[PDB]
Amino acid sequence: KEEAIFRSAEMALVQFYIPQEISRDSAYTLGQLGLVQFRDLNSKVRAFQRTFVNEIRRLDNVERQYRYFYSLLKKHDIKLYEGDTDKYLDGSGELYVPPSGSVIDDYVRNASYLEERLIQMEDATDQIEVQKNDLEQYRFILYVTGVIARDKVATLEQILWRVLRGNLFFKTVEIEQPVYDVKTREYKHKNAFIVFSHGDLIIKRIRKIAESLDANLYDVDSSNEGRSQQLAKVNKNLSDLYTVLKTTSTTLESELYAIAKELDSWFQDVTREKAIFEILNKSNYDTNRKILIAEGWIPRDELATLQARLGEMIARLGIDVPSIIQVLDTNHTPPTFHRTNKFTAGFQSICDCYGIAQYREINAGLPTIVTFPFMFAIMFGDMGHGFLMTLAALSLVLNEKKINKMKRGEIFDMAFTGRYIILLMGVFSMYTGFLYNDIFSKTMTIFKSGWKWPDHWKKGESITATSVGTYPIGLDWAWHGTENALLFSNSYKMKLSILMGFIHMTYSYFFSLANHLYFNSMIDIIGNFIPGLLFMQGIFGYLSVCIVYKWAVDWVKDGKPAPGLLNMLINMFLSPGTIDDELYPHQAKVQVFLLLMALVCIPWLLLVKPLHGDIMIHQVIHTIEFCLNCVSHTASYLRLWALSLAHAQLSSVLWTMTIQIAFGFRGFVGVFMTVALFAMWFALTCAVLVLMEGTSAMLHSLRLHWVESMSKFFVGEGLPYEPFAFEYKDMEVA
C-alpha cells in the first residue's frame, strides 16, 4: 500500500454489478470498510422517484421519533446511560460486522407504538398539570381578582387605568416558587392582582379584559368563614390531585427508564440502516436483469481488500453470485485521498480548510508540516515561551491514549487534534529563541562574545564595542541593553523576512513545475512557469542575492561605501541605470539586463498561452494577477519581522513592569513583593504572550500558507474523498 501524502491517492473508478437479492446486504460489507465514495448516478431523476425513497421516508419517520424520545429524556431528566456496545461490536476496522435482518421492521412497529402511547401519556399528565396549576394558584388567594403571568402587571394596570374612570382601586401581590405551564413550557412567574368596582356593566368589561390576556380570574367568598371553607375544599381536592398525579408520573417516568438506558443502542443501527438506503439511491437499475450498478471511487492500492471482502461475503451467502466489481476508466474527476497518520493529520487539516486539492496534485500539507511551525517560530521565537508551549503540548502527546476518550470540549478538541502542530511549534520556537538569543526576556551568556567592550571607561559615558569575532550560534548577547539594539535586530530580521519569504515562495513555486511535468503539460511550463520564473527570480531573487552579497562583503576594510538595497531596488525600475554607489563590478550592464528580461517576460506570459477565446481572458487576468502580487507578497513577509518585534519588545516591557520593579535589598516586604509580582508576571505572561500573542503569530503563519504559498502551486479545487463509512454518531444532534 503506497502512501498518499506527497500527491493524492491513485483512485480507481470501480462499478458494482450487485444483484437484487443481496443489494441490501452487500451494501453493508462495503459500508463497513469505508473505502468507496459513490457517484450520483441519478442526478436527473426527480428526487422522489429514486426507487428506495419509500424505504428512506419510513426510517426518517423512525428517526423523527427517536429525537422525540430524546426530547422526553430531556424533559423528565433521565441520565441516558448510553451503553456503547454498538461501538464495541462494529469496531470500524474490518468487515466482520454482521447485518440486521427483519429487526428493522420490528423497530418500526416498536417505535410507532411508543410514539402513540407516549403522546397519550404526555397529553394526560399535562392535562392534569393544567388543573394542578389552576388549583395551586386558587389556594394562594384563598370586586374581581385573580392571577396573571407577572409581566402583564404594567399593561393590566395601564389598560385598567384608562377604561373605567382613571379613579379605581387596585392591589397587587407576588407569588413565591413559580410554576411551569403548558403553552410556554417554562417556569414563568405569577402575580396576584385585585381590582374593585361598583358598577355592574364595568365589572363585565373588566372580567372580559382580564380573561382575554394570559390570566384565569376567580370568584372568592366575601367572608372569612367562606374563605376558610373554600380553602379546605380546594386543598381537599388538591391532595387527591397529588394522589392521582404521583402514580401516573411514576408509571410514565419508569416506562421511560425502560428505553432511556437502552435507546442509544437501537438508534445507531437505524442511522446506519438509513445510510445504506441513501447510498443505494445513487444507482441505476435494469428492467431486464435485476442488477444494481453503483459506480464509486476506490483507491487503486485498495482493490486487494475488495476481492477478499467479496469472497468472504460469497462464502457467507449461498447464491453463488458473480459480484463482479470490475473497474473501468472514465473522464470524470476523482477525489483527493491523502493518507495521514496521527502526526500529519493536524497539518493536513489546516491546509485544506483553504481548499481541497486537485486530483494527484502536489499536496501542500506535506511541506506544511515543517513550513507552518517554523514560520510561526520566526514570529514567536523565545526559549522560555517555546518551553511553555512544549510543556503545553508535550503533556497532551505523553498521554494521548487517555485523552483519546474524554469530555472533548470545544477548545479542547482543537487543542488536541493539533497537539503535534503545537509541539513542533514550541520546538522550532525554542531553536529560534536560541538563535534570537532569547530566554523569557533576556539572553543566554553561553558562548564567548565576538564583541569586546574596551578596557576603561567612566560611569555614564557612551561606549562603542569592537568586533573581535563572530558569535557561533545566534545573536550575540552583547546586544542586550544597548541603545542601538533595535538598529541591528530590525535590519537583520527584516532581511531575514525577505530571504525566508523568497525561499518559501520559490520552493512553493517549484511545485508548479513538479505538477506541470507530471500532468504532461509542456505548454504550461513554457507559457506560465519559465516566464514567471525569470520574472520572479530577477525582480526578487536579484534582491535576495544582494542581502547575502552585502552580508559577504566587508565594507569597512575595502574602503568602499556600503550601498542601500532599498535605494538600489527603487532605481532599477525608475531610471534603470545611474547607481548611487555600486555593489559589484559590471553592475548596470546586468542591472538593466534583468529589467529587460522581466519586461520581455510580461508580453510572453500573456501572449504564449492563447496562441499556443476563453483562455485569452483567463491568461490576461493571470499575468496581471501574477505581476502585482509578487510585489505584494515579498512586502507581505515583513509580518514575520513585525510580529517578532512586537513579541520580543512587548515581552521586554512586561518583564520590566512586573519583575524588575520587585528587586531590592528588602527583607520582609521584598519576599512578598517578588512573589506577588511574580504571579503578576507568569500568569500575565502565559495569558498575553503564549495565548493571545501566540495565536496572532499562528494566524499569520496560517496566512503565509493560505495566500503567499498556495497561490503559486495550489491550482483549483477538487471534490473531497469522504467515503461511505460508519461512524458512531451521537444522539446529541437532535
Partner 1 sequence: HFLYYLVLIVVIVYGLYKLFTGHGSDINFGKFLLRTSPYMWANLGIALCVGLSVVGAAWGIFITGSSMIGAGVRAPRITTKNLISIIFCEVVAIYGLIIAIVFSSKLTVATAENMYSKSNLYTGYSLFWAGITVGASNLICGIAVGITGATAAISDAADSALFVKILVIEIFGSILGLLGLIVGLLMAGKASEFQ
Partner 2 sequence: WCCTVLSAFGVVILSVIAHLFNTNHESFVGSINDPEDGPAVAHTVYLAALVYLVFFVFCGFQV
Partner 3 sequence: MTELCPVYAPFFGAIGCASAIIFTSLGAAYGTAKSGVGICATCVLRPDLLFKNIVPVIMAGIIAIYGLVVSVLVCYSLGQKQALYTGFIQLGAGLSVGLSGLAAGFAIGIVGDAGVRGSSQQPRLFVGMILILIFAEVLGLYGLIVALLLNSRAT
Quote the least distance from Cβ 352 to partner 2, whole Å: 36
Backbone torsion region of residue 3, taken as left when φ is above 0, otherwise alpha when ψ lies between -120 and 50, otherwise beta:
beta
Q: Is 411 among the residues that bind partner 3 (CB under 8 A)?
A: yes
- Enter the C-alpha cell of residue 712: 503559486
700 binds, among partner 2, partner 1, partner 3, none (CB under 5 to 8 A by kind): partner 3
CB of 476 to partner 1, least distance (A): 24
User: For the chain, how many residues are written?
Assistant: 734
> Which amino acid is residue 713, in one-letter code?
F
Name which of partner 1, partner 2, partner 3, none residue 442 binds, using a CB cut-off of 5 to 8 Å depending on partner kind.
Answer: partner 2
Q: Which of 354, 447, 451, 492 lies at the binding interface for partner 1 (CB under 8 A)?
A: 354
CA 522 to chain centre: 39
The site for partner 3, by CB under 8 A, has a size of 27
Write the DSSP assignment of 155-173 as a string of letters. Answer: HHHHHHHHHS-S--EEEEE
Q: Which one of partner 1, partner 2, partner 3, none interacts with residue 649, CB within 5 to 8 A by kind?
A: partner 3
- Between CA 115 and CA 109 the distance in angstroms is 10
DSSP 409-453: -HHHHHHHHTSHHHHHHHHHHHHHHHHTT-BTTB----S--SEE-
Question: 358 with 336: CB under 8 angstroms?
Answer: yes
| Cell matching residue 674 | 517578588
Given a contact cutoff of 8 angstroms between Cβ atoms, the answer to whether 347 and 369 are in contact is yes
Site pattern 641..680 for partner 2 (x: CB under 8 A): ----------------------xxxxx--xx--xx--xx-
Q: 655: helix, coil or strand?
A: helix
Q: Map residues 588-627 to x or -, x wherever contact with partner 3 holds by CB under 8 A.
A: ----------------------------------------
Q: Are 476 and 450 in contact (CB under 8 A)?
A: yes
Pick one of partner 2, partner 1, partner 3, none as the site partner of residue 410 (Cβ within 5 to 8 A by kind). partner 3
* Residue 610 to residues 599, 607, 620, 624, Cα–Cα distance (Å): 19, 6, 10, 15
Nearer to partner 2, 349 or 649 (CB): 649
Q: CB of residue 352 vs partner 3: minimum separation in angstroms? A: 12
∠ Cα 554 559 565 (to 5°): 55
Query: Cα separation of 253 and 576, whole Å?
Result: 88
Stretch that binds partner 3, among 225-233, 484-492, 561-569, 594-602 (CB under 8 A): 484-492
Q: 19 to 38, contacts with partner 2 by CB under 8 A? A: none
| 678 interface partner picked from partner 1, partner 3, partner 2, none, CB below 5 to 8 A per type | partner 2
Given partner 3, partner 2, partner 1, none, residue 636, with its beta carbon under 5 to 8 Å by kind, binds: partner 1
**What is the per-residue DSSP string for 448-516?**
--SEE--S---TT-----EE-S--SSSS-GGGSS-TTSHHHHHHHHHHHHHHHHHHHHHHHHHHHHHHH
**201, 315, 328, 628: which one binds partner 1 (CB under 8 A):** 628
* Contacted by 665, from partner 3, partner 1, partner 2, none: CB < 5 to 8 Å by type: partner 2
The residues that bridge with 146 in the sheet, in sequence order, are: 193
480 binds partner 2 (CB under 8 A): yes
Does 457 contact partner 2 by CB under 8 A? Answer: no
Give least dist CB 732 to partner 3, A. Answer: 11
Cα–Cα distance for residue pair 729/264, rounded to 1 Å:
10
Q: Which of 130, 232, 631, 657 binds partner 3 (CB under 8 A)?
A: 657
Q: List interacting residues with partner 1 (CB under 8 A).
A: 353-355, 494, 564, 566, 570, 574, 617-618, 621, 624-625, 628, 631-632, 635-636, 638, 642, 706-707
Q: List interacting residues with partner 3 (CB under 8 A).
A: 353, 410-411, 483-484, 486-487, 490, 639, 642-643, 645-646, 649-650, 653, 657, 688, 692-693, 695-696, 699-700, 702-703, 706
